[PDB]
Amino acid sequence: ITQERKNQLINEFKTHESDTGSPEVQIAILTDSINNLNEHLRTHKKDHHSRRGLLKMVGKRRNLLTYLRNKDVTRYRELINKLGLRR
């Protein structure tokens, strides 16, 4: 467990001090879980059930990224640079 990743990408674009539901925070946590799960699948190549989990996370993260991009174009660009995404 890491609230580290919360308090980092809360404060970058914080609505509240104890913001949790910011797209920033969500996308960041998704990015952390995605990347963790990828390295599981490097080892456990034929864990297909878990891999469907990955594809759902990826789809959530994409949809939240498309949401920012349409909402706040600058705020989107700051998030993808810090996480190191492309889209």
Partner RNA sequence: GAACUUGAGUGCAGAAGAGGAGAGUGGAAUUCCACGUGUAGCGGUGAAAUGCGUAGAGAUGUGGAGGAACACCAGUGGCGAAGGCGACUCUCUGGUCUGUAACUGACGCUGAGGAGCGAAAGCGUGGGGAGCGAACAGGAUUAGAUACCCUGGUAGUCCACGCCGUAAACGAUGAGUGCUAAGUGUUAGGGGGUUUCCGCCCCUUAGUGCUGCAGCUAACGCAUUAAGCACUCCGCCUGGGGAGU
Residue 64 touching RNA (CB under 7 A): yes
40-47, Cβ contacts within 8 angstroms, sequence gap of 24 or more? none
Report the alpha-carbon distance of residue 75 to residue 61 in Å, rounded.
15
The reply on whether position 79 binds RNA by CB under 7 A is no
Identified binder of RNA from the candidate list 11, 35, 44, 77, rule CB under 7 A: 44
Binding-residue pattern over the window 3 to 22 for RNA, x denoting contact by CB under 7 A: x--x--------xx-xxxxx
The answer to whether 38 contacts RNA (rule: CB under 7 A) is: no
Q: Which two tokens stand for residue 7?
A: 């308090």
Alpha-carbon torsion (68, 3, 59, 82), positive or negative: positive
Give the whole-angstrom CA distance, residue 36 versus residue 80. 18
Binding region for RNA (CB under 7 A): 1, 3, 6, 15-16, 18-23, 25-26, 29, 33, 36-37, 40, 43-54, 56-57, 60, 63-64, 67, 71
